[PDB]
């Protein structure tokens, strides 16, 4: 119930903007970032879950990551066989998603 403006903001979030590289090699962000501050019980988490389901690519996480997955990527070296391993984080696992 309610939040028509909020729903429209979420829709334009889902569609997203357009990214633009430049001749100098510099880039400019083409994606939208939103913040929602509110009292408990204001139906915020449900919108996030609906966005996660609606978008073709979507990851839902909290602060400090998830149960067994971090929020950012990390790099290690295998001592037995020398290979540079990288662990996918919640941000790396999404490309073009929400």
Partner 1 sequence: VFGRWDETKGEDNIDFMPTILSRFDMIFIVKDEHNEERDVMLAKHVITL
Partner 2 sequence: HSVREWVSMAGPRLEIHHRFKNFLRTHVDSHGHNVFKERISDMCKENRESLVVNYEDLAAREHVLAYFLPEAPAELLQIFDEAALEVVLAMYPKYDRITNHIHVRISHLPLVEELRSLRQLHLNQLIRTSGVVTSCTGVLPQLSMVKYNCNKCNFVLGPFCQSQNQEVKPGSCPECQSAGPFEVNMEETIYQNYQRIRIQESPGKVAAGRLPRSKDAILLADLVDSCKPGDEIELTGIYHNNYDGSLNTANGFPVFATVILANHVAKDEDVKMITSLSKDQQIGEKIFASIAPSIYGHEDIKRGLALALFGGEPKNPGGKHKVRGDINVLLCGDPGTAKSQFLKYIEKVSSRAIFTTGQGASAVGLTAYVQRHPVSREWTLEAGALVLADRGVCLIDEFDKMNDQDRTSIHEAMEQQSISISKAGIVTSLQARCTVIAAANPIGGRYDPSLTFSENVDLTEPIISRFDILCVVRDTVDPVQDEMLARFVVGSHVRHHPSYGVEPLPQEVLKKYIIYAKERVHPKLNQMDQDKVAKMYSDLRKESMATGSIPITVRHIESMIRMAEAHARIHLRDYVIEDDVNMAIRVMLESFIDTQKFSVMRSMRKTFARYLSFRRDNNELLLFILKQLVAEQVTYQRNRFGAQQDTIEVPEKDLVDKARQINIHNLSAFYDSELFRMNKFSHDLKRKMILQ
Ligand X SMILES: Nc1ncnc2c1ncn2[C@@H]1O[C@H](COP(=O)(O)OP(=O)(O)O)[C@@H](O)[C@H]1O
Query: Distance (Å, rounded) from C-alpha 6 to C-alpha 10?
Result: 6
Cα distance between residue 74 and residue 76, in whole Å? 7
Nearer to ligand X, 3 or 96 (CB): 3
The two structure tokens encoding residue 72: 């950012």
Under rule CB under 8 A, residue 62 binds partner 2: yes
DSSP 3-state of 74: strand
Question: 21 a known binding residue?
Answer: no
Least distance to partner 2, CB of residue 60, Å: 6
* Residues in 19-58 that interact with partner 2 by CB under 8 A: 40-41, 45-46, 49-50, 53
Is the separation of the CB atoms in 58 and 50 below 8 Å?
Answer: no
Judged by CB under 8 A, the residue of 24, 39, 78, 95 near partner 1 is: 39
Nearest to 55 by CA among 92, 95, 6, 20: 95
87 touches, from partner 2, partner 1, ligand X, none (C-beta below 5 to 8 Å by class)? partner 2
Contacting positions for partner 1 (CB under 8 A): 1, 6, 9, 32-42, 44
């Amino acid at each position: 119930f309610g939040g028509t403006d909020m729903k429209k903001a979420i829709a334009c979030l889902l569609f997203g903007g357009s990214r633009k590289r430049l001749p100098d090699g510099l880039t400019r962000r083409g994606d939208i970032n939103l913040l929602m501050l509110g009292d408990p019980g204001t139906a915020k988490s449900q919108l996030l879950k609906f966005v996660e389901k609606c978008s073709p690519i979507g990851v839902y996480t909290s602060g400090k990551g998830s149960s067994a997955a971090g929020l950012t990527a990390s790099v290690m070296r295998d001592p037995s066989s020398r290979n540079f391993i990288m662990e996918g984080g919640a941000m790396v696992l999404a490309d073009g998603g929400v």
